[PDB]
Amino acid sequence: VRSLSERL
Amino acid sequence: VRSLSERL
Amino acid sequence: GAMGSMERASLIQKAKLAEQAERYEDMAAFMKGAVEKGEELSCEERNLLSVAYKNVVGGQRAAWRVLSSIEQKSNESEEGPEVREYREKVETELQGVCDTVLGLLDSHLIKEAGDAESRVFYLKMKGDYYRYLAEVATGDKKRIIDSARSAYQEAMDISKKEMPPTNPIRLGLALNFSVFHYEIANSPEEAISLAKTTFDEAMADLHTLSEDSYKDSTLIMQLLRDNLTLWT
Amino acid sequence: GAMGSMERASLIQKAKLAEQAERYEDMAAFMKGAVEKGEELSCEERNLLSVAYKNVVGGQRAAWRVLSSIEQKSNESEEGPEVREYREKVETELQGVCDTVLGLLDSHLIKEAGDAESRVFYLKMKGDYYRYLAEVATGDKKRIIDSARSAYQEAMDISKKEMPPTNPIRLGLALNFSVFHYEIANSPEEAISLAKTTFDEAMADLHTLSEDSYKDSTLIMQLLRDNLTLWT
Ligand SMILES: [Cl-]
Ligand SMILES: [Cl-]
Ligand SMILES: [Mg+2]
Ligand SMILES: [Mg+2]
């Protein structure tokens, strides 16, 4: 499972 | 609302 | 063509990879390259060709609809040329994709297709891509509409003679011809009649089918039913 | 450049239309054209630039991951070169997009950015696109990783001096630097520490905010919290 990065 | 056409 | 140096089998393999990666523009370029090798296409290869271009043109149609709606609202609010310019840009790209598909069918997929399953598939495709041209056409429009109608009608005559009523290609053809009638040709009564008769004749043939074929046919029948619910 | 003949304002207007139509490649080309006019970018224009390229590179990254996984499985099964070839094709396109963004930042967005909000935004962007290069790099890799780290660190030092702890740009920067630590730099303890301290200091500053700003900050804080839940 991949880490969450910044949303638009 | 748009008619449904053939699926893949 | 940029795919002229790649083996036919490698192009088909990469088309399948592009589909897994949801890279549909690549997928279409690979399948165009495969067609241009000059050999006929198997059932699986025909479906790859159709999946790739349906996804490419589908995104273009969705974008053209957003932009056309913005453009129409602007002509009811405050006023420049940008909305029209950018709708025209997308429209032109859409028409180029349609023309590319129609060119592959004319050079030379259709003339080499002798079996009912291939000939009906390609004639249906021709009707479909003239229908997409018709959605954006503004007189011209009439010739494009008649080209779609003519291709669908030839496919229908073959499919009724040569295929059972539950055949998925025959069902998908009748579904799309009925959408043509309703959405393009201003003939909603013809659309409804074709969908009902298509659904009823398939219902009466389901008893001949295996469990897997039954699932394939009833899936498409459900789309006919959904349209009838919206149209009535 | 193909956008050299179009007005700056028309390019911005069309970028906004492409976003509504989900035409992100067009959106990025329009915003590249806008940047190349040579004027600095407003807050709204900076976000358009970032939205466009984040979506383009995001689709490329998702495709590269599908293909790299297929490639890795093939090296555990039956055996040709196609999977590697097509992964390399997508990877090369991804690297070209990253290089295009980094070139815009270097010529000349960063050197003209004097305010904290613009300078931190562009340095964060630089770290982000070196991070995307690092995800596909195979030694070289070390220089790319250090370039990402260096850009994030400079952005962090400015943001801590010049911005409050709930500032959405400061929060998004710290979020992405923590993902760098966890996913790229093999430093999960540093990732966890940065996320916790960032979350805790923002929590203690929320009382200073309006209802709208409170919603903006807590939205991003929730991503820090979601990562901490996955990492611990
Ligand atoms: Cl345009
Ligand atoms: Cl390739
Ligand atoms: Mg033949
Ligand atoms: Mg300045």
Short mmCIF file of C-alpha atoms and ligand atoms in Angstrom, two decimals:
data_model
loop_
_atom_site.label_atom_id
_atom_site.label_comp_id
_atom_site.label_asym_id
_atom_site.label_seq_id
_atom_site.Cartn_x
_atom_site.Cartn_y
_atom_site.Cartn_z
CA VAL A 1 0.00 0.00 0.00
CA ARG A 2 1.39 3.38 -1.06
CA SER A 3 1.72 6.50 1.05
CA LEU A 4 -0.66 9.40 0.38
CA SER A 5 0.89 12.56 -1.09
CA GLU A 6 -0.55 16.04 -1.44
CA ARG A 7 -3.86 16.50 -3.24
CA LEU A 8 -4.63 19.17 -5.81
CA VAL B 1 -29.81 11.70 -20.13
CA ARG B 2 -27.99 9.87 -22.92
CA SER B 3 -28.85 6.49 -24.39
CA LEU B 4 -26.61 3.53 -23.56
CA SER B 5 -24.55 2.11 -26.44
CA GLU B 6 -22.61 -1.14 -26.68
CA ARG B 7 -20.00 -1.94 -24.05
CA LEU B 8 -16.54 -3.31 -24.70
CA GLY C 1 4.18 4.35 -40.39
CA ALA C 2 6.12 4.52 -37.14
CA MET C 3 5.13 0.89 -36.39
CA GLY C 4 6.39 -0.39 -39.74
CA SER C 5 9.57 -1.80 -38.20
CA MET C 6 7.82 -3.76 -35.40
CA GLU C 7 6.70 -7.40 -35.74
CA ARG C 8 2.96 -8.03 -35.98
CA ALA C 9 2.99 -10.29 -32.91
CA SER C 10 4.95 -7.73 -30.86
CA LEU C 11 2.38 -5.03 -31.74
CA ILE C 12 -0.45 -7.30 -30.53
CA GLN C 13 1.47 -8.14 -27.34
CA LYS C 14 2.07 -4.43 -26.63
CA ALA C 15 -1.57 -3.58 -27.37
CA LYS C 16 -2.53 -5.98 -24.57
CA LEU C 17 0.00 -4.38 -22.20
CA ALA C 18 -1.25 -0.86 -23.02
CA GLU C 19 -4.78 -2.02 -22.17
CA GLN C 20 -3.60 -3.26 -18.75
CA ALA C 21 -1.89 0.08 -18.19
CA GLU C 22 -4.94 2.04 -19.45
CA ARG C 23 -2.77 3.64 -22.17
CA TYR C 24 -5.41 3.67 -24.86
CA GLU C 25 -3.71 6.06 -27.32
CA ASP C 26 -0.68 3.73 -27.37
CA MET C 27 -3.03 0.75 -27.69
CA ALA C 28 -4.68 2.26 -30.77
CA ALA C 29 -1.34 3.10 -32.41
CA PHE C 30 -0.15 -0.49 -31.86
CA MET C 31 -3.35 -1.94 -33.34
CA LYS C 32 -3.22 0.46 -36.30
CA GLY C 33 0.31 -0.84 -36.92
CA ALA C 34 -0.98 -4.44 -36.70
CA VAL C 35 -3.76 -3.77 -39.23
CA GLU C 36 -1.27 -2.13 -41.61
CA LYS C 37 0.70 -5.38 -41.79
CA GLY C 38 -2.04 -6.41 -44.25
CA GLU C 39 -3.22 -9.70 -42.72
CA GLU C 40 -6.81 -10.26 -41.59
CA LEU C 41 -7.59 -9.97 -37.87
CA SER C 42 -8.70 -12.75 -35.56
CA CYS C 43 -11.75 -12.40 -33.30
CA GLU C 44 -9.54 -11.37 -30.34
CA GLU C 45 -7.54 -8.89 -32.45
CA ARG C 46 -10.72 -7.27 -33.76
CA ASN C 47 -11.87 -6.69 -30.21
CA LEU C 48 -8.50 -5.16 -29.27
CA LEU C 49 -8.81 -2.74 -32.18
CA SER C 50 -12.32 -1.79 -31.09
CA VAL C 51 -11.51 -1.42 -27.38
CA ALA C 52 -8.56 0.88 -28.15
CA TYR C 53 -10.30 3.34 -30.46
CA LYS C 54 -13.57 3.29 -28.48
CA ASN C 55 -11.68 4.52 -25.41
CA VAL C 56 -9.73 7.18 -27.34
CA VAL C 57 -12.81 8.58 -29.10
CA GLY C 58 -14.85 8.20 -25.91
CA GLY C 59 -12.63 10.63 -24.03
CA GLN C 60 -12.74 13.08 -26.95
CA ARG C 61 -16.56 12.90 -27.09
CA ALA C 62 -16.86 13.54 -23.35
CA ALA C 63 -14.56 16.58 -23.68
CA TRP C 64 -16.37 17.96 -26.75
CA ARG C 65 -19.66 17.71 -24.82
CA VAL C 66 -18.30 19.70 -21.85
CA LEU C 67 -16.95 22.39 -24.19
CA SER C 68 -19.99 22.56 -26.50
CA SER C 69 -22.21 23.10 -23.43
CA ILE C 70 -19.99 25.93 -22.19
CA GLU C 71 -20.09 27.40 -25.71
CA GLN C 72 -23.89 27.19 -25.91
CA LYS C 73 -24.30 28.90 -22.53
CA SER C 74 -22.01 31.72 -23.69
CA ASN C 75 -24.47 32.43 -26.52
CA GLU C 76 -27.58 32.92 -24.36
CA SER C 77 -24.05 36.02 -20.86
CA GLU C 78 -20.94 38.21 -20.84
CA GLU C 79 -18.61 38.02 -23.86
CA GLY C 80 -13.86 36.27 -26.81
CA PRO C 81 -13.06 33.50 -29.31
CA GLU C 82 -11.35 31.09 -26.92
CA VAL C 83 -14.23 28.74 -26.09
CA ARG C 84 -15.08 28.26 -29.77
CA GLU C 85 -11.41 27.90 -30.69
CA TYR C 86 -10.77 25.18 -28.12
CA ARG C 87 -14.00 23.29 -28.95
CA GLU C 88 -12.90 23.37 -32.61
CA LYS C 89 -9.47 22.02 -31.63
CA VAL C 90 -10.95 19.03 -29.78
CA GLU C 91 -13.57 18.49 -32.53
CA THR C 92 -10.85 18.44 -35.18
CA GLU C 93 -8.85 15.83 -33.22
CA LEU C 94 -12.00 13.72 -32.80
CA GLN C 95 -12.73 13.85 -36.54
CA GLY C 96 -9.14 12.82 -37.27
CA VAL C 97 -9.49 9.72 -35.09
CA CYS C 98 -12.81 8.83 -36.79
CA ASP C 99 -11.23 9.29 -40.23
CA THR C 100 -8.28 7.10 -39.19
CA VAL C 101 -10.60 4.24 -38.16
CA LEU C 102 -12.74 4.61 -41.29
CA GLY C 103 -9.59 4.53 -43.42
CA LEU C 104 -8.47 1.26 -41.86
CA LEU C 105 -11.88 -0.27 -42.54
CA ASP C 106 -11.78 0.93 -46.18
CA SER C 107 -8.09 -0.02 -46.71
CA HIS C 108 -8.67 -2.93 -46.54
CA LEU C 109 -10.37 -4.64 -43.59
CA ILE C 110 -13.93 -4.70 -44.93
CA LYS C 111 -13.17 -5.92 -48.46
CA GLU C 112 -11.23 -8.93 -47.13
CA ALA C 113 -13.86 -9.88 -44.49
CA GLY C 114 -15.85 -12.84 -45.80
CA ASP C 115 -17.24 -14.52 -42.67
CA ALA C 116 -20.37 -13.14 -41.03
CA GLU C 117 -18.68 -12.52 -37.66
CA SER C 118 -15.91 -10.37 -39.15
CA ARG C 119 -17.97 -8.60 -41.83
CA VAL C 120 -20.76 -7.63 -39.40
CA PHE C 121 -18.18 -6.48 -36.81
CA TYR C 122 -16.45 -4.16 -39.29
CA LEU C 123 -19.67 -2.79 -40.81
CA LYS C 124 -20.99 -2.06 -37.31
CA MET C 125 -17.70 -0.24 -36.60
CA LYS C 126 -18.14 1.83 -39.77
CA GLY C 127 -21.63 2.83 -38.66
CA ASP C 128 -20.34 3.69 -35.19
CA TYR C 129 -17.56 6.03 -36.39
CA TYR C 130 -19.81 7.79 -38.90
CA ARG C 131 -22.24 8.20 -35.97
CA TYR C 132 -19.52 9.90 -33.91
CA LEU C 133 -18.81 12.19 -36.87
CA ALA C 134 -22.54 12.96 -37.05
CA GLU C 135 -22.72 14.00 -33.39
CA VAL C 136 -20.46 17.00 -34.15
CA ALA C 137 -21.49 17.67 -37.77
CA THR C 138 -23.28 20.87 -38.87
CA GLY C 139 -24.38 20.69 -42.53
CA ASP C 140 -22.75 17.51 -44.98
CA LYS C 141 -24.43 16.33 -41.79
CA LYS C 142 -26.99 14.61 -44.04
CA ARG C 143 -24.42 12.64 -46.05
CA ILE C 144 -22.63 11.59 -42.85
CA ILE C 145 -25.92 10.40 -41.31
CA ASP C 146 -26.76 8.42 -44.44
CA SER C 147 -23.29 6.82 -44.43
CA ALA C 148 -23.87 5.65 -40.84
CA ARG C 149 -27.36 4.38 -41.70
CA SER C 150 -26.12 2.53 -44.77
CA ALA C 151 -23.34 0.73 -42.89
CA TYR C 152 -25.64 -0.30 -40.02
CA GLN C 153 -28.31 -1.54 -42.47
CA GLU C 154 -25.87 -3.74 -44.37
CA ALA C 155 -24.59 -5.17 -41.10
CA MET C 156 -28.16 -5.79 -39.93
CA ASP C 157 -29.17 -7.66 -43.12
CA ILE C 158 -26.16 -9.99 -42.84
CA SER C 159 -26.59 -10.58 -39.10
CA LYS C 160 -30.26 -11.50 -39.42
CA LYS C 161 -29.47 -14.00 -42.19
CA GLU C 162 -26.32 -15.51 -40.72
CA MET C 163 -26.40 -15.22 -36.90
CA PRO C 164 -28.72 -16.40 -34.12
CA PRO C 165 -30.71 -13.72 -32.25
CA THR C 166 -28.61 -14.03 -29.08
CA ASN C 167 -25.25 -13.55 -30.84
CA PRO C 168 -23.38 -10.79 -28.90
CA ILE C 169 -22.25 -9.02 -32.09
CA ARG C 170 -25.77 -9.06 -33.53
CA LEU C 171 -27.09 -7.74 -30.18
CA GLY C 172 -24.48 -4.97 -29.92
CA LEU C 173 -25.19 -3.94 -33.52
CA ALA C 174 -28.94 -3.69 -32.91
CA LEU C 175 -28.33 -1.77 -29.67
CA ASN C 176 -26.13 0.80 -31.46
CA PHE C 177 -28.43 1.12 -34.51
CA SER C 178 -31.26 1.86 -32.08
CA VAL C 179 -29.17 4.60 -30.43
CA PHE C 180 -28.51 5.99 -33.91
CA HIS C 181 -32.28 6.14 -34.52
CA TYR C 182 -32.99 7.84 -31.20
CA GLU C 183 -30.03 10.21 -30.87
CA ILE C 184 -28.99 10.99 -34.49
CA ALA C 185 -31.88 10.29 -36.87
CA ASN C 186 -34.77 11.82 -34.85
CA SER C 187 -36.67 8.50 -35.09
CA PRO C 188 -37.46 7.48 -31.50
CA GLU C 189 -40.32 5.20 -32.54
CA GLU C 190 -37.94 3.23 -34.78
CA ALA C 191 -35.40 3.06 -31.92
CA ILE C 192 -38.03 1.67 -29.54
CA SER C 193 -39.39 -0.88 -32.03
CA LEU C 194 -35.93 -2.17 -32.88
CA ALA C 195 -34.94 -2.52 -29.23
CA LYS C 196 -38.15 -4.36 -28.26
CA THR C 197 -38.07 -6.81 -31.15
CA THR C 198 -34.35 -7.42 -30.62
CA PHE C 199 -34.90 -8.09 -26.90
CA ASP C 200 -37.94 -10.34 -27.46
CA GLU C 201 -36.29 -12.51 -30.11
CA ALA C 202 -33.19 -12.96 -27.97
CA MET C 203 -35.33 -13.91 -24.95
CA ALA C 204 -36.91 -16.73 -26.97
CA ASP C 205 -33.48 -18.14 -28.03
CA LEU C 206 -31.81 -18.14 -24.58
CA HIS C 207 -32.89 -21.74 -23.92
CA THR C 208 -30.40 -22.92 -26.59
CA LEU C 209 -27.38 -21.49 -24.80
CA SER C 210 -24.74 -22.64 -22.34
CA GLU C 211 -24.42 -20.89 -18.98
CA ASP C 212 -21.47 -18.81 -20.21
CA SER C 213 -23.18 -17.77 -23.48
CA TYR C 214 -26.38 -17.04 -21.51
CA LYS C 215 -24.45 -14.59 -19.33
CA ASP C 216 -22.86 -12.93 -22.39
CA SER C 217 -26.20 -12.37 -24.15
CA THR C 218 -28.25 -11.30 -21.12
CA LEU C 219 -25.59 -8.70 -20.26
CA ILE C 220 -26.22 -6.89 -23.56
CA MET C 221 -29.97 -7.47 -23.42
CA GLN C 222 -29.97 -5.52 -20.15
CA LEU C 223 -28.67 -2.46 -22.03
CA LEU C 224 -31.57 -2.73 -24.49
CA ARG C 225 -33.91 -2.89 -21.50
CA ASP C 226 -32.29 0.09 -19.78
CA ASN C 227 -32.73 2.19 -22.94
CA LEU C 228 -36.38 1.18 -23.29
CA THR C 229 -36.96 2.30 -19.70
CA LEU C 230 -35.47 5.71 -20.47
CA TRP C 231 -37.29 6.07 -23.82
CA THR C 232 -40.74 5.11 -22.54
CA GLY D 1 6.99 27.05 -28.98
CA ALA D 2 3.63 26.21 -30.53
CA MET D 3 1.90 28.53 -28.02
CA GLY D 4 4.14 31.48 -28.86
CA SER D 5 1.44 33.13 -30.99
CA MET D 6 -1.33 32.92 -28.34
CA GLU D 7 -2.06 35.67 -25.80
CA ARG D 8 -1.12 34.95 -22.18
CA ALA D 9 -4.70 35.51 -20.99
CA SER D 10 -6.11 33.20 -23.70
CA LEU D 11 -3.70 30.43 -22.62
CA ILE D 12 -4.89 30.76 -19.00
CA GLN D 13 -8.55 30.77 -20.11
CA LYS D 14 -8.01 27.61 -22.19
CA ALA D 15 -6.11 25.92 -19.35
CA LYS D 16 -9.25 26.35 -17.22
CA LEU D 17 -11.44 24.92 -20.00
CA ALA D 18 -9.13 21.91 -20.46
CA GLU D 19 -9.42 21.23 -16.73
CA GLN D 20 -13.23 21.21 -16.97
CA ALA D 21 -12.96 18.81 -19.91
CA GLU D 22 -10.35 16.64 -18.12
CA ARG D 23 -7.89 17.28 -20.98
CA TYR D 24 -4.79 17.46 -18.83
CA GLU D 25 -2.15 17.16 -21.59
CA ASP D 26 -3.71 20.19 -23.31
CA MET D 27 -3.90 21.96 -19.93
CA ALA D 28 -0.18 21.44 -19.35
CA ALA D 29 0.75 22.66 -22.84
CA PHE D 30 -1.33 25.81 -22.31
CA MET D 31 0.29 26.50 -18.93
CA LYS D 32 3.78 25.85 -20.32
CA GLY D 33 2.97 28.45 -22.98
CA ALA D 34 1.81 30.87 -20.25
CA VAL D 35 5.03 30.41 -18.24
CA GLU D 36 7.13 30.97 -21.38
CA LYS D 37 5.62 34.46 -21.76
CA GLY D 38 8.15 35.38 -19.05
CA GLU D 39 5.90 37.02 -16.45
CA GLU D 40 5.59 35.70 -12.89
CA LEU D 41 2.55 33.58 -12.02
CA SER D 42 -0.25 34.48 -9.64
CA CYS D 43 -1.38 32.12 -6.86
CA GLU D 44 -4.23 30.79 -9.06
CA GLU D 45 -1.95 30.37 -12.09
CA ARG D 46 0.62 28.44 -10.04
CA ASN D 47 -2.08 26.02 -8.98
CA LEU D 48 -3.23 25.56 -12.59
CA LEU D 49 0.34 24.70 -13.59
CA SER D 50 0.58 22.18 -10.76
CA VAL D 51 -2.82 20.56 -11.36
CA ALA D 52 -2.05 20.05 -15.06
CA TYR D 53 1.35 18.39 -14.74
CA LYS D 54 0.38 16.41 -11.62
CA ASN D 55 -2.41 14.74 -13.61
CA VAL D 56 -0.21 14.07 -16.66
CA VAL D 57 2.65 12.57 -14.64
CA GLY D 58 0.16 10.78 -12.38
CA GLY D 59 -1.22 8.75 -15.28
CA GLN D 60 2.32 7.95 -16.47
CA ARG D 61 3.34 6.78 -12.98
CA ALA D 62 0.29 4.53 -12.69
CA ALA D 63 1.09 2.98 -16.09
CA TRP D 64 4.80 2.52 -15.31
CA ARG D 65 3.82 0.70 -12.09
CA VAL D 66 1.52 -1.73 -13.93
CA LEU D 67 4.24 -2.46 -16.50
CA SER D 68 7.14 -2.70 -14.02
CA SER D 69 5.15 -5.27 -12.02
CA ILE D 70 4.48 -7.35 -15.13
CA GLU D 71 8.20 -7.08 -15.96
CA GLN D 72 9.26 -8.18 -12.47
CA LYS D 73 6.94 -11.21 -12.57
CA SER D 74 8.42 -12.21 -15.93
CA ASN D 75 11.85 -12.47 -14.26
CA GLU D 76 10.87 -14.92 -11.51
CA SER D 77 7.94 -17.72 -15.74
CA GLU D 78 7.93 -18.43 -19.48
CA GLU D 79 9.99 -16.13 -21.73
CA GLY D 80 10.81 -11.70 -25.48
CA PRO D 81 11.85 -8.05 -25.19
CA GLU D 82 8.41 -6.47 -25.50
CA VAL D 83 7.55 -5.92 -21.83
CA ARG D 84 10.90 -4.23 -21.15
CA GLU D 85 10.67 -2.22 -24.37
CA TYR D 86 7.22 -0.85 -23.57
CA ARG D 87 8.10 -0.09 -19.91
CA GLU D 88 11.14 1.82 -21.23
CA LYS D 89 8.91 3.75 -23.64
CA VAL D 90 6.55 4.89 -20.88
CA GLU D 91 9.48 5.58 -18.51
CA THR D 92 11.16 7.74 -21.14
CA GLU D 93 7.96 9.78 -21.66
CA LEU D 94 7.62 10.21 -17.88
CA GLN D 95 11.20 11.45 -17.58
CA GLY D 96 10.59 13.91 -20.42
CA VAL D 97 7.61 15.40 -18.59
CA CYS D 98 9.64 15.69 -15.36
CA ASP D 99 12.50 17.35 -17.25
CA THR D 100 10.04 19.78 -18.87
CA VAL D 101 8.67 20.87 -15.47
CA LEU D 102 12.16 21.14 -13.96
CA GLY D 103 13.25 23.26 -16.92
CA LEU D 104 10.38 25.70 -16.40
CA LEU D 105 11.30 26.03 -12.72
CA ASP D 106 14.98 26.65 -13.62
CA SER D 107 14.18 28.98 -16.57
CA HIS D 108 13.14 31.11 -14.78
CA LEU D 109 10.30 30.64 -12.27
CA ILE D 110 12.38 29.99 -9.16
CA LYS D 111 14.93 32.79 -9.59
CA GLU D 112 12.16 35.41 -9.93
CA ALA D 113 10.10 34.11 -6.95
CA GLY D 114 10.72 36.41 -3.99
CA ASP D 115 7.66 35.95 -1.77
CA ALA D 116 7.47 32.97 0.58
CA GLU D 117 4.23 31.61 -0.94
CA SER D 118 5.65 31.47 -4.47
CA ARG D 119 9.21 30.42 -3.59
CA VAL D 120 8.08 27.57 -1.32
CA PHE D 121 5.52 26.43 -3.92
CA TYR D 122 8.15 26.20 -6.68
CA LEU D 123 10.82 24.57 -4.50
CA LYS D 124 8.27 21.98 -3.35
CA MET D 125 7.46 21.35 -7.04
CA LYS D 126 11.16 20.85 -7.79
CA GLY D 127 11.40 18.28 -4.99
CA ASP D 128 8.26 16.54 -6.24
CA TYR D 129 9.48 16.12 -9.85
CA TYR D 130 12.94 14.94 -8.79
CA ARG D 131 11.07 12.46 -6.56
CA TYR D 132 9.14 11.14 -9.56
CA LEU D 133 12.44 10.78 -11.43
CA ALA D 134 13.82 8.88 -8.42
CA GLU D 135 10.95 6.38 -8.42
CA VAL D 136 12.15 5.04 -11.81
CA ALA D 137 15.89 5.67 -11.46
CA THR D 138 18.48 2.86 -11.32
CA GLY D 139 21.99 4.20 -10.54
CA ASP D 140 22.63 8.47 -10.83
CA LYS D 141 19.77 7.47 -8.55
CA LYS D 142 21.81 8.93 -5.70
CA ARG D 143 22.27 12.35 -7.31
CA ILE D 144 18.56 12.49 -8.21
CA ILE D 145 17.58 11.63 -4.62
CA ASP D 146 19.89 14.31 -3.26
CA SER D 147 18.43 16.88 -5.68
CA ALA D 148 14.93 16.09 -4.38
CA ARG D 149 16.13 16.26 -0.75
CA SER D 150 17.91 19.56 -1.32
CA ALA D 151 14.87 21.24 -2.89
CA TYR D 152 12.50 20.02 -0.15
CA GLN D 153 14.93 21.14 2.59
CA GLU D 154 15.24 24.66 1.20
CA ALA D 155 11.46 24.89 0.93
CA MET D 156 11.09 23.61 4.50
CA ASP D 157 13.54 26.18 5.96
CA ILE D 158 11.69 29.07 4.28
CA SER D 159 8.22 27.79 5.22
CA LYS D 160 9.11 27.37 8.89
CA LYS D 161 10.50 30.92 9.04
CA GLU D 162 7.84 32.66 6.98
CA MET D 163 4.54 30.75 7.22
CA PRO D 164 2.20 29.68 10.04
CA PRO D 165 1.99 25.95 10.82
CA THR D 166 -1.51 25.59 9.32
CA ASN D 167 -0.60 27.16 5.96
CA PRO D 168 -1.82 24.71 3.24
CA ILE D 169 1.39 25.03 1.20
CA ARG D 170 3.56 24.42 4.27
CA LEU D 171 1.36 21.41 5.15
CA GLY D 172 1.46 19.94 1.63
CA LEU D 173 5.24 20.39 1.54
CA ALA D 174 5.73 18.57 4.84
CA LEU D 175 3.35 15.80 3.73
CA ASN D 176 5.34 15.24 0.50
CA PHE D 177 8.77 15.46 2.18
CA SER D 178 7.57 12.79 4.60
CA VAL D 179 6.55 10.56 1.67
CA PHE D 180 10.01 11.14 0.20
CA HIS D 181 11.56 9.93 3.47
CA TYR D 182 9.36 6.84 3.65
CA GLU D 183 9.17 5.80 -0.01
CA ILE D 184 12.44 7.08 -1.57
CA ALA D 185 15.06 7.66 1.13
CA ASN D 186 14.52 4.48 3.23
CA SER D 187 14.02 6.65 6.35
CA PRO D 188 10.63 5.65 7.78
CA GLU D 189 11.46 6.97 11.26
CA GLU D 190 12.17 10.42 9.79
CA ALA D 191 8.90 10.24 7.82
CA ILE D 192 6.92 9.42 10.97
CA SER D 193 8.59 12.11 13.09
CA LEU D 194 8.02 14.79 10.48
CA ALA D 195 4.36 13.85 10.02
CA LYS D 196 3.64 13.80 13.78
CA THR D 197 5.34 17.11 14.54
CA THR D 198 3.70 18.72 11.50
CA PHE D 199 0.25 17.48 12.58
CA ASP D 200 0.71 18.48 16.24
CA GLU D 201 1.90 22.02 15.48
CA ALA D 202 -0.97 22.57 13.06
CA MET D 203 -3.48 21.29 15.64
CA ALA D 204 -2.28 23.93 18.11
CA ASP D 205 -2.70 26.78 15.56
CA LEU D 206 -6.21 25.90 14.33
CA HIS D 207 -7.83 28.20 16.90
CA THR D 208 -6.48 31.22 14.97
CA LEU D 209 -8.35 30.36 11.78
CA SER D 210 -11.63 31.19 10.10
CA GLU D 211 -14.10 28.41 9.33
CA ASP D 212 -12.99 28.28 5.68
CA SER D 213 -9.25 28.21 6.50
CA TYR D 214 -9.95 25.61 9.22
CA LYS D 215 -11.52 23.34 6.60
CA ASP D 216 -8.57 23.85 4.21
CA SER D 217 -5.94 22.95 6.83
CA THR D 218 -7.77 20.02 8.45
CA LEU D 219 -8.28 18.46 5.01
CA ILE D 220 -4.51 18.15 4.53
CA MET D 221 -3.90 17.23 8.16
CA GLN D 222 -6.12 14.20 7.58
CA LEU D 223 -3.67 12.95 4.94
CA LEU D 224 -0.82 13.19 7.47
CA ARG D 225 -2.97 11.20 9.88
CA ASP D 226 -3.86 8.56 7.27
CA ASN D 227 -0.16 8.04 6.51
CA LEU D 228 0.72 7.72 10.20
CA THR D 229 -1.96 5.03 10.51
CA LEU D 230 -0.42 3.07 7.65
CA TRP D 231 3.18 3.57 8.85
CA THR D 232 2.56 2.57 12.47
CL CL E 1 -7.11 26.14 -28.98
CL CL E 2 7.41 0.04 -27.33
MG MG E 3 -11.14 -13.22 -45.90
MG MG E 4 9.49 38.46 -8.07
#
